[PDB]
Design a protein around this ligand. Structure first.
Ligand SMILES: [NH3+]CCc1ccccc1
Ligand SMILES: [Ca+2]
Length: 223
């Protein structure tokens, strides 16, 4: 996250870190046994780390549960990043409390103008690199579909939205991938892609979760 603030320990209780010996992607807990992330975060041998604030320090609220199955969206295209969403099932169910909690799926798509919370452990510089160890938070509005398509001519599908600031300085960034965009207490987006980070007229692009709600529900009902 570039241009954000420190969230505070366990103030984003649905936030997960996907670990393969190191943090590589964020994710969101949608119930005690299922995590949703970006399909471009797919990897074998994922351990899901819940209850994290400092990802380099065991602070006491963590639950490290290995993944038993990962399901990438059947129409994920890695060249266009259309349908950049995947589900991860935990080997055992997470123990849910004030600090580890699932986030609700949407019943409505969020509109342009809606303010949202984006969070992650990704890079905090738009030029060069500095990775935080504690979770960073950013409040950003969903942008109109027409300013999104004007920023990324020919690349925005109906399964994407833009969120952020057209004049840059504030954005999600590398390592924030797969993480949550929560608007009014519902998961509306997944950190998916963009052109660099926090650049003028290059806002973050996010997977539009409301389009995927019945694939998610069907898939967890059957796996
Ligand atoms: N400018 C969009 C933000 C972004 C950039 C790279 C990876 C994930 C998110
Ligand atoms: Ca920790």
């Amino acid at each position: 996250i570039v241009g954000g603030y420190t969230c505070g320990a366990n103030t984003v209780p649905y936030q997960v870190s996907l670990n393969s010996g190191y943090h590589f992607c964020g994710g969101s807990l949608i119930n005690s046994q299922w995590v949703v992330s970006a399909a471009h975060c797919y990897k074998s041998g994922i351990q899901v780390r819940l209850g994290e604030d400092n990802i380099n320090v065991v602070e006491g609220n963590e639950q490290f549960i290995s993944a038993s199955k990962s399901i990438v969206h059947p129409s994920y295209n890695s060249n266009t990043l259309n349908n950049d969403i995947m589900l991860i099932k935990l080997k055992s169910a997470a123990s849910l409390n004030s600090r580890v909690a699932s986030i609700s799926l949407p019943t409505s798509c969020a509109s342009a103008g809606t303010q949202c919370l984006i969070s992650g452990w990704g890079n905090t510089k738009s030029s060069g690199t500095s990775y935080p160890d504690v979770l960073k938070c950013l409040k950003a509005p969903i942008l109109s579909d027409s300013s999104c398509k004007s920023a990324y001519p020919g690349q925005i599908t109906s399964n994407m939205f833009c969120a952020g600031y057209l004049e840059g300085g504030k954005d999600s960034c590398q390592g924030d991938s797969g993480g949550p965009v929560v608007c009014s207490g519902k998961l509306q987006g997944i950190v998916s892609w963009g052109s660099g980070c926090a650049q003028k007229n290059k806002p973050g692009v996010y997977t539009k979760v409301c389009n995927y709600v019945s694939w998610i529900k069907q898939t967890i009902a059957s796996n």
